[PDB]
Amino acid sequence: PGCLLYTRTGSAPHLTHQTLRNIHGVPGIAQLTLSSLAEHHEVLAEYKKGVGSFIGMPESLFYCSLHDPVTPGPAGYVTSKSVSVWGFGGRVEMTVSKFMAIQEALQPDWFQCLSDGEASCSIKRARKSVDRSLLFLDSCLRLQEESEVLQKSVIIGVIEGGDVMEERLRSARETAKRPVGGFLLDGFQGVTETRLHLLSSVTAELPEDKPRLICGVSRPDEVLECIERGVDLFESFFPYQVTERGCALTFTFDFEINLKEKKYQEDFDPLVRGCSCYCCKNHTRAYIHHLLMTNELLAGVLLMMHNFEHYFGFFCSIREALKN
Template identity: 60%
Template sequence: MMMKLTLSKVTGSARLGVITALAQSGGEKTLEVPGCLLYTRTGSPPHLTHDTLQNIAGVPPVTHLTLSTLAEHQEVLEEYKEGIGKFAGLSDTLLYCSINDPVTPNPPGYNTNKTVSVWGSGGRLELTPQRFVSLQGALRVDWIQCLCDGEAAADGCSRKRAKKSVDRSLSFLDECLKLMSENEALKQKVVIGAIEGGDLQEERLRSARETAKRPVGGFLLDGFQGGSGDPENKLNLIAAITAELPEDKPRFIHGIGRPDEVMDCIERGVDLFDSTFPYEVTERGCALSFTHQYQPDPETAGEPQRPVLDKKELINGEQTEDESEDAEDDRSSITAYEICLKEKRFREDFRPLLQGCACYCCRHHSRAYVHHLLISKELLAGILLMIHNFQQYFNFFRSVREAISDGKFQDLKEMIRKQAS
């Protein structure tokens, strides 16, 4: 079974389309691209229950699980016999399982020609293709990122290491595909092949061409997360890779979530992203505060449907003299797309987190209240911020799709870029 990507418009390399035939069970679910997946930790959306998740509009129909957090629970799932979807209450969504959690990547130096190491709460686990396939049999997800050697990052590695990452990953892919084809429960699953090769274009292109020859349903551009390395070189590499891949299969990327970086990747042919960025913003005690309304509708000018950004709220560390009330708070990771609600200036700010936002938090609570919750270290702070940040992020991708459809992609990209400067 292969999922089907149908493109309706391509602007440069930015692709607008819809993925159908998402799972072997059939059904009517579709996933629009460009888009993102619903990020979870050990099968649950961070800070949220499945009930509170219902307060968020436009939740993606595909949920992102991570093998590193689930591998140690294999025996429990094998005994349960009905898969992680039912076990974690995720039976109404499609499931995609990546090897690593983009928020906490594995330490390098532990992969071999025969095993890939992942780290769970109990320490390191070595996965052979055989163990990987048996683990997938217990999980019963719909889309499976194949076992790969993802240690050769795009911000630099030796030529020898880059070549080894490609050779190992192709070998793992071939072995896993063979084992899955012999397993009745797994033979119809969608396999996502990883494109490896570090920062060497020739190895990346070899990986792309060879992976595309295998019966995979999509491609993961691996190793691009992390802030080091030349951003322009990474983008050129992404553009070269996507140019080699077939048009009718989706391209995934992990660990890239900042709005301006997302726009750069979409412009170079990437289709699907994780939604770890809203979680990271929440963990910083921050709220997404950027606008993605590229074209105001005069008919609805009096009733804003999208967030309206107060220019004074663009935070980059120099634009406010107010210090956070948490002395240990690290401001270096705060982006220009968010406001830090731990700051003293929000103590008596009774506006919603973002003017014009229709999320549950902004409809019912103020910045001052969320500030109080954060300073008091109340768990409700994370819940309210997660609802807001997920809602804003999912709305952002909707705006990207609308911009491509309307021929306004560059206008939106410029608007997003200006908010970072």
């Protein structure tokens, strides 16, 4: 398995270049949301040396994800001619040609194919979705080879088969024929027992030579059960949600608490008691409590850094446990 560093316009949200570099456990791959790279598309249409130099970090690998994990899916908006990526760009009829132009301007290492199948959020519609998604993947594969510079990029496949698990199996079977560099699961945005069973059935057929991607799943329990099913790569929008509403993570891997209460003004210990995390060394929880009462941005920065460090450490620990 693995993890993708959640990036808000190159860097982490509420994180600058130096502050992000100060974060430990940073993976070598940065997940750029295609939902927030439209104005960047017009800017990079003539920048002509990639987005890695544009953001200042050219040495890292880039993944162009469509759905922002914070806002990953409705009851249904995604079709197989455009994808209403929830974010900061790419809403106005982002057709196949628009996707090609955006990925030519950005030049991502791996670019994600457009999703489909909003049923998981019975047979006839499922079969239509399967055939349409296969046609879209074929069109993207055909258009990817038309540009020599674009040929360095990698397509990521998608699996969508309506409601009936048999049609999802047939979608996975027929999509796995194409030589895609990855696989995606849509409609499992978080998950329940029925969706868990559908995910297990879908993943029971996909070949192991390509990675598996899921969207909308970041909670520790949902992530754990999806890994148990066989999903490899995950998103990291949970710390952003926890920090946005003035809350600090508390679950130990080796929920959230709201600090807007008067009970934390007497404790001199940090948010974590005697551990080796960043919060155990930066300040004390009374400082964050005061800064939250005064509504100071430095509290947000510290909470964001601590949440990201804890989440990345959790992913590193689970990956080490699974590998060993």
